[PDB]
Design a protein around this nucleic acid. Structure first.
Lengths: 82, 101, 62, 97, 97, 62, 101, 86
DNA sequence: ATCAATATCCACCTGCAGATTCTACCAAAAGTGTATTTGGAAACTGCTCCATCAAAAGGCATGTTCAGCTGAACCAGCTGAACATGCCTTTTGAGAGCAGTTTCCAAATACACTTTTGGTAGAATCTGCAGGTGGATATTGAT
DNA sequence: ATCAATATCCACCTGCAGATTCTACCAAAAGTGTATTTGGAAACTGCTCCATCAAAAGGCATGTTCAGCTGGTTCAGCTGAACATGCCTTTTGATGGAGCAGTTTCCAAATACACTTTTGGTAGAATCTGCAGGTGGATATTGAT
């Protein structure tokens, strides 16, 4: 069953991410908080992206929309065109 | 053998650190991420379609942001003479960098 | 140039992005210029904070 | 037969790479990264030059504006070497019209 | 007697203040602050709108682009109220020439 | 509007910068919009963390 | 009273807090700051002059930056169950903000 | 005489001034070591800002640094300043 | 807890340093008219995207287990706040450089037409590298 | 120290998806010439920067006193990394067919540009009052006792 779908981002994936950060030991309460944190970031990005998408009066979301929306948060991204 | 071989805590974690630090493949699963993105965008506008590359771009951005945060968080934890990260560490880091939300 | 030096260091003849990330982050000045940039498929630098590593008191102590 | 046209900086990157390291290749993804990089720096510098020119009520962009922008954006020795290269380029170009 | 002319937005702010809180004044320094504030916001919006135009190969900046920029910069209910004021204003302009 | 309210709190009929700083920092949205701006002669809010304040169990003690 | 009146430790600081937070006047004296500016400018270009308002503006910016830094510092301190700030807190704050040193 | 007032330099930025600033930041108790580090930090900040200002100054062929140059230099570092023009 | 000390809050009075308001003008807003653009209605194609199936396989859920970690108590000591003070550093007031305009021009540079022309789309070949195959080490922990 | 267990680096080595080479075109770079626009070198005007010396006001370098914070130690819990096991959400890998990305036609809707005509926004010279400053006294707050 689906659990509002944020739960597809399982615990061990988050654990792997923390491992890449150089972390050795993780409390069990981090995971839930992280999910919420992640959601916020994504929400903001997508809003901006969709807004760009809406201006072109298109219905298909393009990578460039995401790239610009990331650029505006000061997290510029290279490697996906433009 | 009389007992199963069993590493002590930390060793295998460190092994995983060096492994993932040597490689570059994305760690988040593709399909669940796709479904999450589709649900949220549906909440903003209906019946949208997504290029594959945009989804990949979001994937990269999310993972980079998370690792950056966890790095600063780990520093915060070590500052308090601990080795176990906790929520208030994250909250502190997020409050200082100005991502208050 | 820096990337190619890293390439020869890893015994690979064709350049891939990991080499670029290694080249950028290991130079102070380029790190300042590109402190807020994400290289896709780039990964991160190897780095372990010294204090989290186990003690070197792992040998005969009897 | 209707078909498109997409511009890039691939060939120039390839030339430079062969000049510095003749026996070595590079993947397309990294070429994409370099393309994004070039475009980003282009945007930053042009933006800064614009702001300078506007604050002094001058309507023209010359090499001077670019130079000032470079010294502001880039740090130290990198700025010096870049300035030297650009200066040599201009002096040779104006000499050999 | 060379006599200059330095422009500002002071008087409009003063009018608005007398409209919203009639028995109240405001010093010169605070007015200067508000002037700088308005200048900042104007620059942000115009820059954003410009980039929006360039990405979609449009040569006209329209009210729609402004609206988009406002939806990007500002959060929530503030954006909605600003948008409502703008729409009311443009609707009044379009009719009663 | 916000500045005028803060002005009435201090019984001053003329708006000064302190009032503007109080107005901006006490409204969440403006604080987000102007998160990286300094108001000259603005100062800061009186927020002191509760921990560094003395013990509220300072009462009848014999 | 035979004893001169004396306040307990941790009150005159509070009095200072309330006084300086109710007011907006600059805390640092003008002259040494002015001399500092001129001395530093000399090492980049010679025979420069400074308008007064430029120095005042710099002073305002410096004080706001340091004030913000001390706020972040105190939070980093409180995380370690202390009340006294120390250099490693400052180093942490500047590491998290993304600045150089 | 060697007076050289506390160094004829930054050390004229005395301890109690730093204390006052720390009081504005909500701080109650300060170690003796803070002072030196603070000075270093301050110096660094000033350096970068002044450099940019002077660079703007050099572009217009002036020998007097104006307020506007400083404001713009503060803007590029993400420390926008209001109340001194633009 | 009660009473002394003493800063802070708060009423009442005056004048003058900044706020506000009147006045003669010139840079700026706006209405015509034309020309000159430009972006949305209409009509189509073709690549890429959304809902289905099938044979594995590798990752997630759940359940044991124990080494090693996170607060809570307590405290030697250090170290940094509170005051007397005197003493010394910081405030205040009595001509030429340079920012800010203005002329006006030798120099710089957009723009119409053609003439090339290297750059790009796309077909047609290379080969280093993702895998595999296997052997030799290098950490790790038990003892 | 030593020796068994698991994980990791390294020599041989092969077929191909991605890298590079190669045709054939034509949508961008230069030339020629011209029409149009500028930044910077001479005059000039009016703020306001260079940073001394008396006289005076008020902040700091020093020393002195002690309470309450740091940061070390000891330790009772506790909780989260390792791991086996099953099994079951996903991986590759195909196939369809609908429809949006994107292209082309072209002309009705929206704007520059160039001119003329109001007009109100801005210096500068005459009037105002809220607040700086002063004066003074009731109550709130620390702390000895």
């Amino acid at each position: 069953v689906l659990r509002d779908n944020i739960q597809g981002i399982t615990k061990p994936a988050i654990r792997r991410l923390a491992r890449r950060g150089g972390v050795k030991r993780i409390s069990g309460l981090i995971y839930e908080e992280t999910r919420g944190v992640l959601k916020v970031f994504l929400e903001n990005v997508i809003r901006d992206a969709v807004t760009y998408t809406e201006h072109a009066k298109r219905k298909t979301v393009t990578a460039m929309d995401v790239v610009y929306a990331l650029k505006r948060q000061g997290r510029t991204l290279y490697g996906f065109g433009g | 053998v009389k007992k199963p071989h069993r590493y002590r805590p930390g060793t295998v974690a460190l092994r995983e650190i060096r492994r993932y630090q040597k490689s570059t493949e994305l760690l988040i699963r593709k399909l669940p991420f796709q479904r999450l993105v589709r649900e949220i965008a549906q909440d903003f506008k209906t019946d949208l379609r997504f290029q594959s590359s945009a989804v990949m771009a979001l994937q990269e951005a999310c993972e980079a942001y998370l690792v950056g945060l966890f790095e600063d968080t780990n520093l915060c934890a070590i500052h308090a003479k601990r080795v176990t990260i906790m929520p208030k560490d994250i909250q502190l880091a997020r409050r200082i960098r100005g991502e208050r939300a | 140039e820096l990337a190619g030096n890293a390439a020869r260091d890893n015994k690979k003849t064709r350049i891939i992005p990991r080499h670029l990330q290694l080249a950028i982050r290991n130079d102070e000045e380029l790190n300042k210029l590109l402190g807020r940039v994400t290289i896709a498929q780039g990964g991160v630098l190897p780095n372990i904070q010294a204090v989290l590593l186990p003690k070197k008191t792992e040998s005969h102590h009897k | 037969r209707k078909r498109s046209r997409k511009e890039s900086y691939s060939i120039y990157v390839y030339k430079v790479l062969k000049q510095v390291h003749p026996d070595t290749g590079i993947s397309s993804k990294a070429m994409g990264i370099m393309n994004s990089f070039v475009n980003d720096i282009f945007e930053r510098i042009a933006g800064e030059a614009s702001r300078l020119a506007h604050y002094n009520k001058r309507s023209t962009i010359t090499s001077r504006e670019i130079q000032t922008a470079v010294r502001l954006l880039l740090p130290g020795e990198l700025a010096k070497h870049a300035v030297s290269e650009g200066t040599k380029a201009v002096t040779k170009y104006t000499s050999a019209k």
